[PDB]
Design a protein around this ligand. Structure first.
Ligand SMILES: CCCCCCCCCCCCCCCCCC(=O)OC[C@H](COP(=O)([O-])OCC(O)COP(=O)([O-])OC[C@@H](COC(=O)CCCCCCCCCCCCCCCCC)OC(=O)CCCCCCCCCCCCCCCCC)OC(=O)CCCCCCCCCCCCCCCCC
Ligand SMILES: CCCCCCCCCCCCCCCCCC(=O)OC[C@H](COP(=O)([O-])OCC(O)COP(=O)([O-])OC[C@@H](COC(=O)CCCCCCCCCCCCCCCCC)OC(=O)CCCCCCCCCCCCCCCCC)OC(=O)CCCCCCCCCCCCCCCCC
Ligand SMILES: CCCCCCCCCCCCCCCCCC(=O)OC[C@H](COP(=O)([O-])OCC(O)COP(=O)([O-])OC[C@@H](COC(=O)CCCCCCCCCCCCCCCCC)OC(=O)CCCCCCCCCCCCCCCCC)OC(=O)CCCCCCCCCCCCCCCCC
Ligand SMILES: CCCCCCCCCCCCCCCCCC(=O)OC[C@H](COP(=O)([O-])OCC(O)COP(=O)([O-])OC[C@@H](COC(=O)CCCCCCCCCCCCCCCCC)OC(=O)CCCCCCCCCCCCCCCCC)OC(=O)CCCCCCCCCCCCCCCCC
Ligand code: HAS
Ligand code: HAS
Ligand SMILES: CCCCCCCCCCCCCC(=O)O[C@H](COC(=O)CCCCCCCCCCC)COP(=O)(O)O
Ligand SMILES: CCCCCCCCCCCCCC(=O)O[C@H](COC(=O)CCCCCCCCCCC)COP(=O)(O)O
Ligand SMILES: CCCCCCCCCCCCC
Ligand SMILES: CCCCCCCCCCCCC
Ligand SMILES: [Ca+2]
Ligand SMILES: [Cu+2]
Ligand SMILES: [Cu+2]
Ligand SMILES: [Cu+2]
Ligand SMILES: [Mg+2]
Lengths: 54, 189, 325, 54, 63, 573, 143
């Protein structure tokens, strides 16, 4: 989760046909998604999108 | 446009309801076989004198009423009315919970004047068929309550609407099975 | 009409020669069906073998082939000729099937002796119900049913204390059973022998005390399930044979799972001369205190089963292969 | 009455969900089908908890 | 071809041992053990045959 | 038309995910508890099935060891009776039916171009209920009395409160019921993914034969499993309470027999059609020829869908309670579609280029076995022949050529076939061939002469026999070859274990070369969502046209017998 | 599913025809290898077996009327036609395993015929089914 983000349940199909899952980053991203990996902090990380009140 | 296409959850639930119908194929088979050789020696007639046909009609209309209210609740979900769904589902829960109490009371008043599982083949066949249906009705009521407490926490998107529509499918199936089961037991004898 | 000798022997696959005209018909049908089945199997296997020895990868390299040769997928003309052929085969086979099955399932053979077979856990019990006046004790048609012993069963229909759950009858209504005068009872250490005449139409009446059993005689090439309350189950409890052609002792087994000692309830058929059988019946009728073995000795037969032996009941014995008595 | 979270659709020649048809091939998203993901890490309101042990 | 013939001969001798061993122990518990012996023998023979029939038409090459 | 996209500069390749050799601690422990991926679920669904195979087959050896010689050497009547009950049950419901859904969970979403199954959390429930049912059923052995001892058919009134008392008989009922929920929970979402979740351009008639077979099985399993649950809950209601539904005095015996066999034979054909599909996948790829009579196969599979429902009392010819002409004829019909789809296999191999890898070896070693199994099936379908053969030992030989035919030969074929797809590694060929030859010789040896003994008068469920019967040499031969059959799993287990972590790495998305299914257009293994890109589907073989463009005109021009004159037809608007 | 709704009519009409043949042939034919009279298991369960196929067939038929031409149902469709969202699939959940454990508890409850065990197993099953459905609904923790 810290490396890639919350696994949202939105399986989009890209124009090429690649099935991709939408990931919600909890941290800043670099250039094109791929979030900067947040270091472990000894606390509970959210795992679902409802845990962020969505 | 958005290129509309079949509801996946609805098709999944219909395919589930089909198999639940063959579950009652077994029960109906057991009832009809026991009826066939019960008529043979003229013993069936004596056993069906324990039936309260008028009382079984009142609960029937109650269950049919529950179905109609259920449909009204679903008519409210298509339009995103949270409160329309909330109201009619509560009335359906109330209507469907008095069927179970009503059905339960019939059992209590039936074992009082002779008919039990361990008393006749008729008794065993009556309670197997009507008992499993009662379990299904309880399951349906619990489905309603969980849908009610599901739309209490979530934001009521089409996802919650779909959940409500499929639970209504289950309820309609249950009451249709009852309609078919009441004719078999109380009318055809 | 079996095909030839040794070949005919091969086609049987250990099927008993059969001692009954019914068995003969079934045997013939079986032999011919196997002749056809072997042919079809040979063709199918032949094609599977040619797939190995003819159509190969680097078999097709000497000829400068390559890959993807003749990529056909739909031979419509040869597709409606290979659907029809199995249909014709199965129809012509079914004709003979229904033709043959009519012989055995017929109930109009005019039997001259009826036997009441009663299967229980775990043995057999035979009783001579009717015997034709010809091979009878006196000449009047033998009528084997017990007056008071059967009427006591007929009275088990209702429980004196309130218990009539099964369609207003006692749960333990043992009235479908038939009790007779001349009865051979099989003990755990005495194989029941049913004595029958030769060249006579026999009828068998099957019922079970408790659970489903199966009256199987390998020499008859026939078996039938005996069911408790056969009428309620809507199973025909009666089957008949034209005659028995052979003379001797023939095994019979229970070919239906019925509890533990299922492998251990075997009976014997002793087919004896007509006159001899009559004499047997006379002796056992006039001596109601006698035993089956004594009656068998009376007519010069072996007193005990020759094709079968009782099993030794001791569990922790038989380890050395000595399981007979 | 129409729920705030109900997707903003024209009530003319179009229905978002009925008994048997829908707009997606699969289950509708429980966080709004019209919600665009992912979002900035700020909107999630997740506070990465800096911790130091000893 | 090398491994094959060795496996065939070993299997054959084990199987022969088993067949011989059955005859002494009549209908005892040891008949089961002798059955295991012949089964192992037959297994080894078929293993030898299988390796023989693989080095004839191989489908995997050593890199 | 085709709408060729512009050549984008920079596009290199997908990630090409790593094979299964390199797994770290904790990478699988909690993942498998909560997984909803059909890939991992299918893998564990197959593994569990094979575990139960090994466990349930050990019972067959104990049975087979006892029958070596007359007399009770180590096993009793009670222990022998409950040993074929649990052998026939674990092998049919704990190995057979699951292994069907394992090949269904893995490759069906991968064959239609779906990202996932329709109900990911439901098939995850279908796996966990089946295992629980299995564990519940086998708890009978942990009771002093033992497991259920009535057979796998639980006939009445042998299986009532009076006869066969003890908690093992309840455990059997309940375990069967539970394992039957897993089958319907899996059939729900094997039927709705086909409807809903399909790749652009994959029409219903572009789907492989495998998916058509699982389609038909799904609709066929929805109407049989509930019926069994109803019948078994009727028996439990009779046993636990004081119900009289199954008393002999009102049907009871026949009632159960009808109710059981009505699902008895449909469950039998839920074990055959998917494996016919598996074989129908393997033959075309190794023959470099398309699946002969594709629509023919569709119609054949659809026929067996409907016909299988009308043939159930051919299992009870000797009861003397059923209409012999009706069921005798109906059974003769169900051999006709099988014959059709069996000629189609020969047609596919006809004048092909066959390479003999392990999958093709297994598939061909299948047809030779199942053929004889089915041949002696039409024997039993005629009542004049079934009178002698019913409830006997010829029957035992018959349904071991068809069960051990389909669920073993074709299952193993499927394992060798799809192993590179599932794991990114390949199985040892030499060990695969050793396994095949062992399991082949060891099977035919143990089951051929089984026919002969059954005809000469040995019935099936017999703990013991007498020396004065002649069934000594035959039992001895069968036992010897059965112990050989039991050893064949040693190469299989070693192959699977070794090759899982050390097998040769797959570096191409189609290791078998000429794969023509949508699963062979992806990396080995696929990247968690089945597809890093999706091709154009224009026929039933999208991966073949993808890999071999130079022959797309050849596979259309000579696909038909002749009179094909559309290549010279004017264009449409 | 254009063709899916249609192919169910095949089995439906087949089983409907067999069920009516079965009833009439079993109650009016005396074979000698059986008795005469309608069989009440092969009749009810084969009439109602056709019912399942009819139900599914009719439902899919009504559904397929009011669906547009989907790319998966189009013979010459580009891969880029379905480019969009394929709805919501659950990534993971522990509740399937739990509720299998719950059905196992009720199963053994019925086996041993212990009332407390049946009752606990029943309410241990309601809980897990409820949690399965409310998994993505559990509100953000309010302090
Ligand atoms: C007619 C008969 C049928 C009844 C119809 C039922 C329809 C209910 C639909 C409404 C609904 O579910 O509301 C959403 C509501 C959502 O609650 P929530 O906001 O998530 O509260 C949890 C928060 O963390 C904290 O939020 P909170 O502090 O505001 O929680 C309020 C709390 C109030 O506190 C309590 O009452 C806790 C004590 C538990 C009751 C124990 C009784 C023993 C004395 O209520 C509960 O916890 C539920 C207990 C209700 C008693 C049910 C028995 O669901 C429930 O909590 C109720 C569950 C409904 C189960 C139905 C059982 C009764 C049926 C038969 C009578
Ligand atoms: C075709 C195949 C036919 C032949 C099958 C027989 C040959 C055996 C070959 C098996 C194989 O291919 O490799 C196994 C393969 C090893 O894969 P890997 O990538 O090397 O994972 C090991 C690594 O150390 C990474 O895993 P890890 O060490 O991080 O995780 C530890 C895990 C590693 O072990 C497992 O995942 C399997 C443990 C389940 C069986 C033991 C019962 C435990 C309860 O063991 C546990 O901690 C078990 C606790 C979780 C499950 C409790 C339920 O394991 C599996 O694929 C799991 C399938 C097991 C079936 C599910 C059983 C469910 C439990 C029911 C109770
Ligand atoms: C005999 C029992 C046979 C069991 C056979 C296996 C069950 C198959 C369920 C088919 C439903 C297909 C489906 O849509 O799956 C949704 C969902 C799968 O989750 P998912 O795939 O990740 O999400 C699906 C969609 O993506 C997103 O869709 P969604 O999340 O919006 O789903 C909306 C959900 C919302 O519905 C609910 O919240 C209802 C919750 C169930 C009520 C509790 C009943 C207890 O609606 C459904 O669950 C679909 C149909 C609604 C009515 C089904 C009621 C079944 C009652 C149990 C059958 C009769 C029991 C009598 C026996 C008595 C002994 C216990 O299934 C469930 O929620 C499970 C509910 C049924 C469990 C029954 C197990 C009972 C076993 C008893 C053994 C003794
Ligand atoms: C095979 C059978 C498999 C069964 C094993 C699976 C059961 C898993 C238990 C659920 C609790 C764990 C959890 O929440 O997620 C994991 C959670 C980590 O995930 P997470 O990020 O925190 O998200 C999960 C949520 O927080 C969690 O969501 P939440 O925040 O909404 O839930 C809070 C709380 C709900 O709040 C409560 O406090 C509920 C109060 C209970 C109500 C009960 C009603 C009656 O959850 C619970 O406590 C539910 C536990 C109920 C499970 C009942 C089913 C057990 C099966 C029965 C078998 C009985 C066998 C008898 C033994 C016989 C011996 C001879 O913590 C753990 O890792 C605990 C691990 C538990 C062990 C699972 C591994 C089992 C391996 C066994 C080998 C076989
Ligand atoms: C997956 C494994 C299995 C499949 C598939 C299967 C399908 C059939 N079965 Fe079966 N079965 C029986 C016979 C058949 C027939 C005719 C077919 C059909 O599927 C066969 C299809 C036909 C073929 C596979 C042949 C294809 C080959 C060619 C070449 C095509 C053309 C052939 C033609 C046209 C025939 C012409 C041939 C001639 C020789 C004229 C009978 C008796 O008629 C019983 C009950 C016995 C009793 O009385 O208790 C039975 C019950 C069972 C049982 C349990 C029995 C028990 O009592 O517990 C198992 C485990 C089993 C295995 C399997 N069975 N079967
Ligand atoms: C697909 C389904 C089936 C397979 C596979 C199968 C395999 C065999 N069968 Fe069978 N079978 C019989 C012989 C065999 C033999 C020799 C094998 C062979 O394939 C043997 C396979 C053996 C193995 C594959 C064992 C390998 C395991 C080893 C070498 C050691 C394992 C070690 C450990 C530590 C275990 C691992 C444990 C873990 C927990 C991982 C006999 C007669 O000897 C009867 C009738 C009994 C009677 O008298 O009626 C019979 C009865 C049946 C019945 C009817 C059940 C009934 O009548 O109630 C069915 C449905 C059936 C299916 C199947 N059968 N079989
Ligand atoms: C085994 C599952 C079968 C479920 C069938 C449902 C039968 C409903 C029972 C109705 C009571 C009949 C009146 C009667 O005779 O009462 C009593 C007998 O019946 C009972 O005790 C009711 C059994 C309770 C059902 C258990 C529920 C099972 C949970 C399902 C989990 C799978 C009268 O007792 P008596 O003869 O006076 O001593
Ligand atoms: C934490 C460790 C506990 C130590 C226990 C040691 C293990 C031995 C256990 C023996 C179990 C005996 C079970 C038994 O015989 O059943 C019964 C006897 O004992 C009991 O009733 C068990 C009661 C346990 C509490 C369940 C309460 C349910 C209400 C839940 C409401 C929240 C007999 O069955 P019956 O009562 O007739 O249904
Ligand atoms: C009331 C007329 C009775 C017609 C019944 C026809 C008998 C059918 C025989 C068996 C079916 C074989 C296809
Ligand atoms: C006297 C003959 C009557 C035959 C009636 C057959 C009806 C069987 C189907 C019943 C379906 C109930 C749901
Ligand atoms: Ca022995
Ligand atoms: Cu017996
Ligand atoms: Cu027996
Ligand atoms: Cu069958
Ligand atoms: Mg039988």
């Amino acid at each position: 989760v810290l490396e890639h983000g919350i696994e949202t349940g939105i399986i989009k199909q890209m124009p090429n046909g690649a099935f991709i899952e939408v990931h919600q980053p909890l941290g800043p991203v670099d250039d094109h998604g791929h979030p900067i990996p947040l270091p472990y902090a000894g606390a509970a990380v959210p795992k679902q999108m409802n845990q962020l009140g969505y | 446009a958005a290129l509309n296409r079949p509801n996946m959850v609805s098709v999944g639930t219909i395919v589930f309801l089909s198999q639940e119908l063959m579950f009652f194929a077994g029960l109906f088979a057991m009832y009809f076989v026991s009826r066939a050789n019960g008529l043979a020696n003229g013993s069936w007639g004596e056993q069906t004198d324990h039936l309260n046909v008028p009382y079984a009609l009142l609960i029937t209309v109650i269950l049919v009423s529950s179905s109609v209210t259920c449909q009204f609740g679903v008519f409210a979900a298509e339009r995103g009315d949270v409160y329309g769904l909330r109201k009619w589902f509560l009335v359906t829960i109330i209507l469907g919970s008095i069927f179970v109490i009503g059905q339960g009371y019939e059992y209590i008043t039936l074992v009082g004047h002779g008919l039990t599982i361990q008393s006749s083949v008729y008794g065993s066949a009556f309670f197997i068929t009507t008992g499993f249906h009662a379990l299904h009705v309880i399951a349906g009521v619990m489905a309603f309550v969980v849908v009610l407490m599901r739309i209490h926490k979530s934001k009521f998107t089409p996802a919650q609407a779909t959940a409500a529509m499929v639970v209504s499918y289950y309820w309609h199936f249950v009451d249709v099975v009852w309609i078919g089961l009441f004719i078999t037991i109380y009318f055809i004898q | 009409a079996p095909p030839g000798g040794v070949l005919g022997d091969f086609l049987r696959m250990g099927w008993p020669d059969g001692i009954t005209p019914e068995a003969v018909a079934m045997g013939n049908f079986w032999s011919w069906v196997w002749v056809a089945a072997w042919i079809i199997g040979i063709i199918m296997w032949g094609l599977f073998l040619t797939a190995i020895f003819a159509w190969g990868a680097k078999r097709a390299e000497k000829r400068g082939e390559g890959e993807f040769p003749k990529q056909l997928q739909y031979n419509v003309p040869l597709e409606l000729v290979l659907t029809i052929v199995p249909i014709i085969i199965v129809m012509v086979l079914f004709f003979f099937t229904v033709q043959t099955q009519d012989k055995v399932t017929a109930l109009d053979k005019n039997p001259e002796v009826t036997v009441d077979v009663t299967a229980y856990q775990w043995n057999w019990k035979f009783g001579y119900s009717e015997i034709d006046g010809s091979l009878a004790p006196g000449g009047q048609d033998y009528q084997g049913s017990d007056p008071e012993r059967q009427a006591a069963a007929e009275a088990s229909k209702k429980d004196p204390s309130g218990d009539n759950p099964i369609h207003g009858n006692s749960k333990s209504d043992v009235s479908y059973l038939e009790f007779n005068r001349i009865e051979t009872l099989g003990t755990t250490d005495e194989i029941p022998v049913m004595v029958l005449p030769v060249n006579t139409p026999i009828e068998f009446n099957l019922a079970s005390a408790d659970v489903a059993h199966s009256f199987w005689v390998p020499e008859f090439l026939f078996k039938r399930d005996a069911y408790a309350h056969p009428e309620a189950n809507k199973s025909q409890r009666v089957f008949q044979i034209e005659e028995i052609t052979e003379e001797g002792a023939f095994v019979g087994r229970c070919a239906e799972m019925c509890g533990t000692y299922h492998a251990m309830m075997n009976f014997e058929l002793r087919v004896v001369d007509r006159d001899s059988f009559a004499e047997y019946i006379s002796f056992r009728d006039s001596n109601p205190d006698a035993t089956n073995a004594q009656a068998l000795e009376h007519i010069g037969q072996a007193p005990y089963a020759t094709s079968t032996s009782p099993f030794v009941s001791d569990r922790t014995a038989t380890r050395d292969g000595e399981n007979t008595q | 009455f129409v729920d705030p979270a109900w997707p903003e659709h024209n009530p003319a020649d179009g229905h978002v969900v009925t008994e048997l048809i829908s707009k997606v091939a699969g289950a509708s998203s429980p966080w709004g089908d019209d919600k665009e993901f992912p979002v900035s890490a700020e909107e999630t309101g997740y506070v990465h908890p800096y911790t130091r042990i000893n | 071809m090398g491994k094959s013939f060795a496996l065939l001969v070993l299997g054959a001798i084990i199987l022969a041992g088993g067949v011989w061993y059955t005859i002494e122990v009549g209908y005892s518990v040891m008949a089961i053990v002798a059955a295991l012996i012949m089964a192992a023998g037959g297994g080894i023979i078929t293993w030898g045959l299988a390796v023989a029939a693989d080095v004839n038409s191989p489908t995997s090459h050593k890199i | 038309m085709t709408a060729v996209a512009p050549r984008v500069d920079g596009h290199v390749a997908p990630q090409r995910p790593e094979p299964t050799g390199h797994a770290r601690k904790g990478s699988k422990a909690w993942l498998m508890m909560t997984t909803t991926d059909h890939k991992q679920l299918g893998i564990m669904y197959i593994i569990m099935s094979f575990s139960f195979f090994f466990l349930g087959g050990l019972m067959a050896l104990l049975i087979r060891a006892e029958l070596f010689t007359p007399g009770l050497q180590f096993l009793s009547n009670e222990q022998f009776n409950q040993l074929f009950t649990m052998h026939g049950t674990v092998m049919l419901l704990l190995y057979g039916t699951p292994i069907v859904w394992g090949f269904a969970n893995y490759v069906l979403p991968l064959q239609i171009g779906a990202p996932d199954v329709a109900f990911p959390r439901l098939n995850a429930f279908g796996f966990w209920i089946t295992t629980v049912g299995g564990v519940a059923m086998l708890t009978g052995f942990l009771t002093p009395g033992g497991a259920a001892d009535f057979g796998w058919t639980m006939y009445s009134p042998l299986s009532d409160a009076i006869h066969s008392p003890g908690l093992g008989s309840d455990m059997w009922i309940v375990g069967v019921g539970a394992t039957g929920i897993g089958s319907v929970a899996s059939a729900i979402n094997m039927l709705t993914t086909i409807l809903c979740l399909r790749a652009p351009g994959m029409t219903m008639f572009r789907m492989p034969i495998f998916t058509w077979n699982i389609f038909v099985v799904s609709v066929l399993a929805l109407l049989i499993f509930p019926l069994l649950l109803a019948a078994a809950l009727g028996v439990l209601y009779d046993r636990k309470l004081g119900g009289h539904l199954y008393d002999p005095a009102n049907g009871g015996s026949l009632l159960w027999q009808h109710l059981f066999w009505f699902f008895g034979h449909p469950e039998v054909y839920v074990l055959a059609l998917p494996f016919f599909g598996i074989v129908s996948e393997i033959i075309p790829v190794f023959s470099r020829k398309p699946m002969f009579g594709y629509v023919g196969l569709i119609f054949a599979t659809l026929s067996i869908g409907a016909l299988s429902m009308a043939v159930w009392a051919h299992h009870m010819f000797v009861t003397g309670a059923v209409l012999l002409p009706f069921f005798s004829f109906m059974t003769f019909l169900i051999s006709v579609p099988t014959g059709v789809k069996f000629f189609n296999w020969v047609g596919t191999m006809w004048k092909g280029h066959i390479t003999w890898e392990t999958p093709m070896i297994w598939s061909v070693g299948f047809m030779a076995t199942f053929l004889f199994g089915g041949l002696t099936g039409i024997m039993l379908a005629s009542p004049p022949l079934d009178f002698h053969l019913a409830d006997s030992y010829f029957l035992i030989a018959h349904f071991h050529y068809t069960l051990f035919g389909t669920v073993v030969f074709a299952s193993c074929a499927g394992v060798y076939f799809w192993f590179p797809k599932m794991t990114g590694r390949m199985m040892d060929e030499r060990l695969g061939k050793i396994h095949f030859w062992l399991t082949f010789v060891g099977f035919h040896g143990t089951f051929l002469i089984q026919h002969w003994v059954g005809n000469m008068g040995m019935p099936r469920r017999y703990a013991d026999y007498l020396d004065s019967d002649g069934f000594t040499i035959y039992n001895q031969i069968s036992t010897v070859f059965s112990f050989l059959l039991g050893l064949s799993v040693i190469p299989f287990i070693w192959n699977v274990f070794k090759s899982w972590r050390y097998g040769e790495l797959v570096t191409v998305d189609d290791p078998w070369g000429y794969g023509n299914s949508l699963e062979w257009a992806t990396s080995c293994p696929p990247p968690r969502h089945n597809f890093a890109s999706l091709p154009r589907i224009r026929s039933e073989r999208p991966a073949f046209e993808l890999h071999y463009p130079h022959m797309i005109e050849r596979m259309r021009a000579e696909a038909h017998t002749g009179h094909h004159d559309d290549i010279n037809a004017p264009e449409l608007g | 599913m254009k063709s899916s709704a249609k192919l169910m009519y095949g089995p439906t009409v087949f089983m409907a025809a067999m069920a009516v043949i079965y009833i009439f042939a079993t109650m009016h034919v005396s074979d000698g290898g059986s008795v005469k009279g309608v069989e009440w298991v092969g009749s009810v369960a084969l009439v109602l077996s056709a019912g399942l196929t009819l139900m599914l067939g009719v439902y899919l038929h009504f559904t397929e009327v009011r669906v547009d031409v989907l790319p998966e149902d189009w013979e010459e469709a580009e891969v880029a036609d379905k480019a969009g969202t394929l709805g919501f699939f659950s990534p993971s959940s522990i509740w399937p395993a739990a509720m299998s454990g719950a059905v196992g508890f009720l199963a053994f409850g019925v086996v041993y015929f212990h009332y407390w065990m049946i009752a606990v197993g029943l309410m241990l099953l309601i809980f897990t089914i409820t949690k399965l459905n409310l998994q993505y609904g559990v509100p953000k923790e309010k302090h």
